[PDB]
Structures are given as structure tokens and as C-alpha cells.
Design a protein around this ligand. Structure first.
Ligand code: A1L0O
Ligand code: CA
Length: 256
């Protein structure tokens, strides 16, 4: 499941990975969700790849997450920035629609996408209410390999039944889904035996995940490599806790 050459901190911080990405547009009339764009590596010689499904926040679309497409997928992943059914979907519905996008990748995706996909190594990512929907899709399908809630928003504060390795990225100055009442109590109610981490960004707002951010990208790549690819070549950056300057607080259940 290991793809690409051995990583240094300069390769994870790279804006482009060792693979050339291609895309495939998915209609909004696909069952269960509002469609999106499927970013996938072109070179099929290193084998098949795992996949992640990315959800945008409340009253937002995949354009708010588009920069995760070619970025992560060039490091060796299938990335699916999806649109929801309506722009007002609650976090619970964004969980379902995250799973209907993954199922679409397995059961209905184009042949070029189907051939490069390992349908057993799947994951979810999401921003704001898409991060709450990231937490729900874990509860809804415990077979998922990774879960990455970006500045997540949810009314439910306790998430002790989650079994997926979850990486909650926080934003210091977020006042829409503030970390003290959302991102932190979400992480602390995750099971202490779960492989998990909490990264809070200094001076960041609710919308920091919507523009390219080397701090966000380098450890989303490490997290998706470690748990979707079972790639222990990326534990060096996760354990012990990263000590970057753009990070104001880091918490984790290291080592893993
Ligand atoms: O009180 C409420 O009604 C309420 C509703 C929704 C939220 P949420 O945290 O989901 O906001 C989504 C932010 O992301 C969407 C976005 C992405 C990129 C650019 C601009 C906007 C919080 C409170
Ligand atoms: Ca639809």
C-alpha cells in the first residue's frame, strides 16, 4: 500500500506530489449526493490507491475545498470534493452524503477511476458542518480508514463511539464553530484509546481550511498516508507532536 518515494519534511510540504493528477466530473443527479470532482493519480504502475471524500461546510460548495483535490491526490490518493443535496444540509445528512459519494466511487465511478481504486481503503474529510458530517460518517460506517474534521461544527459534543482514527484541525480565532465548544470537546470525547490528534492553528479563522495552507496539507497527507495507506513512513511527522510555529496547541494519543 506504500506509494511514492520515502518522505522527508520537504516532500510532504511540497505543493505537488510524485504523481500527476487527473479529474472526472460527476453529475449532480448521482444518487445520494450532489456530485463533485474526482481527482485521481494517472500513473497506475505503483498499484491501486485509497480514496477520501471531502465535504464542504454549511451553505458552501466544492469550490471551497477544491484546493485539496490536486494537492493530496498528487501524493497518491483519490480525492472527491463533493457537493451536497441542498446547501442547508445538517451535519447528519452530510455524513450520509459522504458515504453515498464513496459508494459512487466503488459502484458507479468511471472506468478510469474504478481501475485505480482499492475499494477497501476509504476515508472522509470535511470542513465546518462537513467536519461534523465527517464525525457522523465514522459512526455510520466504522470500516472507514481515516476521518479529518476541519474546523468542525456539531451540536453533539460527545463522540465516544467513534472507532476511526480522527484528526481534528482547530482554528485559534474561530468564532463560528469555536474550538472551546466544538473542536476541543469533540476531540476529548473521542476514546482515549483511539489513534487521534488535535491541531490548533495560531491566529486562524473558521475559513483557514478553505485556502492553501502548508501546515494543514502536510499533516492531512501524513494522516491519510498513515491510516489509509497503513504507511508507517509518515509516523515521523505525527509522533511526537509536531512543533511548527503556525501551531498554537497540539494534542494526540501518540505513539501510533
Ligand atoms: O447558526 C447557524 O445557523 C450556523 C450554520 C452553519 C455554520 P458552519 O460552521 O457549518 O459554516 C460553514 C462555513 O463554511 C462554509 C464556507 C466555506 C468556504 C467559504 C465560505 C463559507 C455555523 C452556524
Ligand atoms: Ca443527486
Amino acid at each position: 500500500y506504500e506509494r511514492g518515494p520515502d518522505p522527508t519534511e520537504d516532500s510532504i510540504e511540497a505543493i505537488r506530489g510524485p504523481f500527476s493528477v487527473a479529474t472526472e466530473r460527476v453529475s449532480s443527479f448521482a444518487s445520494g449526493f450532489g456530485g463533485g470532482t474526482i481527482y485521481y493519480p494517472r500513473e497506475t504502475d505503483e498499484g491501486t490507491f485509497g480514496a477520501v471524500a471531502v465535504a464542504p461546510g454549511f451553505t458552501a460548495s466544492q469550490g471551497s475545498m477544491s484546493w485539496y483535490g490536486e494537492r493530496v491526490a498528487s501524493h497518491g490518493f483519490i480525492v472527491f470534493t463533493i457537493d451536497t443535496n441542498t446547501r442547508l444540509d445538517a451535519p447528519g445528512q452530510r455524513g450520509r452524503q459522504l458515504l453515498a459519494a464513496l459508494d459512487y466511487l466503488v459502484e458507479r465511478s468511471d472506468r478510469k477511476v474504478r481501475e485505480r481504486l482499492d475499494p477497501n481503503r476509504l476515508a472522509v474529510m470535511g470542513h465546518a458542518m462537513g467536519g461534523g458530517g465527517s464525525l457522523e460518517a465514522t459512526v455510520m460506517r466504522p470500516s472507514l480508514k481515516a476521518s479529518i474534521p476541519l474546523t468542525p461544527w456539531h451540536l453533539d459534543k460527545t463522540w465516544g463511539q467513534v472507532q476511526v482514527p480522527t484528526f481534528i484541525i482547530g482554528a485559534e480565532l474561530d468564532t463560528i464553530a469555536p474550538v472551546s465548544t466544538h473542536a476541543k470537546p469533540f476531540y476529548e470525547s473521542l476514546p482515549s484509546s483511539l489513534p487521534k490528534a488535535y491541531m490548533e492553528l495560531c491566529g486562524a479563522t473558521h475559513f483557514a481550511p478553505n485556502i492553501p495552507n502548508t501546515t494543514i496539507a502536510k499533516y492531512v497527507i501524513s494522516w491519510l498516508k498513515r491510516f489509509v495507506d497503513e504507511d508507517t513512513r509518515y509516523s515521523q511527522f505525527l509522533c511526537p507532536n509536531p512543533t511548527d510555529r503556525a501551531i498554537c496547541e497540539y494534542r494526540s494519543t501518540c505513539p501510533y
